[PDB]
Amino acid sequence: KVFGRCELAAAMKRHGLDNYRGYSLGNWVCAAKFESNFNTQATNRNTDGSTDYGILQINSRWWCNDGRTPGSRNLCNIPCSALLSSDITASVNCAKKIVSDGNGMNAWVAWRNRCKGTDVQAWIRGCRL
């Protein structure tokens, strides 16, 4: 499913993501924008073998099991395909574990290169929330 900007903002807030570990909504919506372009099915294969999956391009080396990343840790205890669903629940619950890991939203390289320190408030601007 390709979400619309305020449609995803409302789903992320609904899932506890507005201000989860201090990251206003705006940060999370800017992160999904540049990671996947709001598309729950987007997948990307990194140069280390692993593959990135879903709305928040969650990586198969640490966080989910995709059966083709040797040495992977599956810390969110989930098959990576649960992350592609049109229901963002699994993606949001995994992202909550990743932001808590010590480095916040810096885990997401497009958040720190493109979002971080921008008027992430603009990503939720005309929305009924």
Side-chain angles (χ1 to χ4, degrees):
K1 174 179 161 57
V2 182
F3 277 84
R5 186 196 140 232
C6 302
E7 184 184 20
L8 183 69
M12 289 183 151
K13 198 188 198 174
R14 202 197 125 204
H15 288 90
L17 239 28
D18 194 5
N19 248 272
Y20 191 79
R21 194 226 84 196
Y23 290 87
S24 70
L25 202 71
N27 288 286
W28 293 102
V29 173
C30 184
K33 179 64 194 183
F34 294 130
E35 281 304 344
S36 66
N37 202 216
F38 306 137
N39 172 19
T40 72
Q41 299 186 256
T43 53
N44 283 287
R45 190 92 63 107
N46 308 130
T47 174
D48 66 1
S50 68
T51 307
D52 303 332
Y53 291 90
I55 197 84
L56 292 169
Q57 293 297 87
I58 290 177
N59 184 268
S60 71
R61 167 80 199 140
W62 312 281
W63 301 106
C64 61
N65 193 215
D66 64 5
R68 58 164 204 211
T69 308
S72 157
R73 275 229 302 222
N74 200 9
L75 295 165
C76 293
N77 226 104
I78 218 172
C80 299
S81 56
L83 273 14
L84 306 185
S85 176
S86 62
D87 175 24
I88 68 169
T89 301
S91 276
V92 165
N93 290 14
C94 197
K96 285 181 180 164
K97 283 201 128 101
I98 305 175
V99 256
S100 304
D101 200 47
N103 266 93
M105 277 197 81
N106 290 117
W108 290 271
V109 185
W111 180 80
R112 56 164 214 280
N113 290 145
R114 309 183 77 165
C115 302
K116 193 178 196 185
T118 75
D119 183 31
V120 300
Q121 188 212 12
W123 291 107
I124 58 173
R125 198 130 298 173
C127 317
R128 291 207 55 91
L129 265 26

